[PDB]
């Protein structure tokens, strides 16, 4: 925008942190002016603290109000634990099976250096193991991966490629372990 | 296990733009459409299991607006330093000929949260089927955004996501072909 | 089942 005017930005974060489900919960409230956090409430501290001089008047005014501080501490139960239980079925317990395909990167004769591709996409959650098998045996040497890609979508995608010399009678299996499966998925190329 | 639920709001002057959204482990659960006072579920499924009183978001934004004015006055009208975005362009899934996919333009690591995004197919700006997420939070207080274009994959068509942002000295033009 | 927001507080003036 050819518009030259100065901008002023206010951001607020309430962060609920869950360990072993709701066994341990931590609440972080964060006031952020022009990308710099000024004041925060941390449930592990239980009061407001200036992160910069600009925040000092707000820490002091808020911490002044006993009943206010008492509710902010109770919010680990009345906000964090509550909202966790609201979303659990479709959030924490969300399982979406990956689509797994394997194909060569080049059609070429037997006995030649090839790249075999194992694309795994559409999956949730992010936790997953893809392992490469030659005739029954796994290998770790020539395994390259694009890592975990977030689609913005509540789905992830990944490639794991395998550098390999295909030989007469060789069967290659891509092995995917994901929380959605009662036991790993397997797709072959012969 | 380990989960994080974030309630993230912002207000920006002089644009008078405000957003309200909840985040679970880096995906959006919902945001509030301020104009229509409606909760917008990132997947429609979620609205079948849970509700949110959208009006609540407008009380928080009113107070965000009041706080932005106080902090502006306190800072003696010090403005934000523009941070330019990084742009990745990628596909929703692997790409097969004549099997409809979706093109993602991912825009990351930028503030303030105002960008202009254009989809160019063979040089023509295209608008058919386009959608976008809201401005998503990052731990460093910068923003992420997703822009989406459904399309038919072919060797005929070449793609560009064009991003404009105050932190850039010219528009970023990120390319995709098959 | 209903999500609850936490209220933003007004800064000192």
């Amino acid at each position: 925008m050819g518009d030259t005017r100065p901008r002023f930005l206010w951001q607020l974060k309430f962060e609920c942190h869950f360990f072993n489900g709701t066994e341990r919960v931590r609440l972080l409230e964060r006031c952020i002016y022009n990308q710099e956090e000024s004041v925060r409430f941390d449930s592990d501290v239980g009061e407001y603290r200036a992160v910069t001089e600009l925040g000092r008047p707000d820490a002091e005014y808020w911490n002044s109000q006993k009943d206010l501080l008492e509710q902010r501490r109770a919010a680990v139960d009345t906000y964090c634990r509550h909202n966790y239980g609201v979303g659990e079925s479709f959030t924490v317990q969300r399982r979406v099976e990956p689509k797994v395909t394997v194909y060569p990167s080049k059609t070429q004769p037997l006995q030649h250096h090839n790249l075999l591709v194992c694309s795994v996409s559409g999956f949730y959650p992010g936790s997953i193991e893809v392992r490469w098998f030659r005739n029954g045996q796994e290998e770790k040497a020539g395994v390259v991966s694009t890592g975990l890609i977030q689609n913005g979508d509540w789905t992830f995608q990944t490639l794991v490629m395998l550098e390999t010399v295909p030989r007469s009678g060789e069967v290659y299996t891509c092995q995917v372990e994901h929380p959605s499966v009662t036991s790993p998925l397997t797709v072959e190329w012969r | 296990e380990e989960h994080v639920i974030i309630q993230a709001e912002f207000y920006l002057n002089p644009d008078q733009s405000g957003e309200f959204m909840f985040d679970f482990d880096g995906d959006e659960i919902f945001h509030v459409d301020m104009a229509k006072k409606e909760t917008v579920w990132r997947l429609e499924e979620f609205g079948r299991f849970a509700s949110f009183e959208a009006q609540g978001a407008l009380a928080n934004i009113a107070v965000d607006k009041a706080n932005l004015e106080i902090m502006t006055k306190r800072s003696n009208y010090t403005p934000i330093t523009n941070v330019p975005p990084e742009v990745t362009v990628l596909t929703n899934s692997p790409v097969e000929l004549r099997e409809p996919n979706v093109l993602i333009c991912f825009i990351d690591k930028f503030t303030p949260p105002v960008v202009n995004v254009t989809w160019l197919r063979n040089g023509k700006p295209v608008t058919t089927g386009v959608s976008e997420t809201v401005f998503l939070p990052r731990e460093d207080h910068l923003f992420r955004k997703f822009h989406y274009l459904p399309f038919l994959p072919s060797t005929e068509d070449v793609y560009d996501c064009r991003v404009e942002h105050w932190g850039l000295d010219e528009p970023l033009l990120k390319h995709w072909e098959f | 089942p209903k999500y609850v927001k936490q209220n933003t507080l007004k800064l000192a003036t």
Epitope: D67, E70, Q71, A74 | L58, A62, A66 | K2, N7
Partner: T-cell receptor, first 111, second 112 residues
Framework: ADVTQTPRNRITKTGKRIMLECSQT?????MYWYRQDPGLGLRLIYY???????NKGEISDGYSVSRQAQAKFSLSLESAIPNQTALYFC??????????FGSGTRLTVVE | AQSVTQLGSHVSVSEGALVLLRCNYS??????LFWYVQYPNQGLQLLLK??????LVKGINGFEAEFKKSETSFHLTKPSAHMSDAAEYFC??????????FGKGTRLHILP
Amino acid sequence: ADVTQTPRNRITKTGKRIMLECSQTKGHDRMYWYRQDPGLGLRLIYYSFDVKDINKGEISDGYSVSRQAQAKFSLSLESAIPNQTALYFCATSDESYGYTFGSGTRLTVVE
Amino acid sequence: AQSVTQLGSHVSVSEGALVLLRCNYSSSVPPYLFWYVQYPNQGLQLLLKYTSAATLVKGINGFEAEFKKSETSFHLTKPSAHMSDAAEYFCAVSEQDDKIIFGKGTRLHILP
């Protein structure tokens, strides 16, 4: 007083548009109009969380409001009927469920 | 459906005796709860407020109320009824939605 209502006492004939005014000095974003009747408690008519923000309560029918400024929240009886005879209370709320009620408007609608 | 139920429009207590006013609530959400008093020919005054901080809430003049989740109750008590306790009392709930829904109210009559 933070919250002041005008008028404090009004008689009106049925079929008339009449306006009750609430004004506040604590610069609170949340404002509310309630009516109180014997045996029914306070019922919420309309509420506002920002300038030009309007939300229907339990009993909005026969009423309208405006929030042109932060300091003021106006209630209008569109076409006054006798069962709109009540004590009307404007309220503001802070950010932590601290309500301040106005001292009330006694409105009597006669046929 | 956020609601609060008070029992009895008009109730009596002997001067000097324990005051007990009943309120039961209905909420999908851990609530804010309130008791207000309206003294004759005046407005509404907050007596006390439940915020989940503590199950025993204390207010002005010896008023107290105990939150009991298991019987969804928030009964107001005062140790000794005075003539000046004659008033209307209202219980109120918010399902954390920044609006207070009121019960129908109980007027307390003090028998001298």
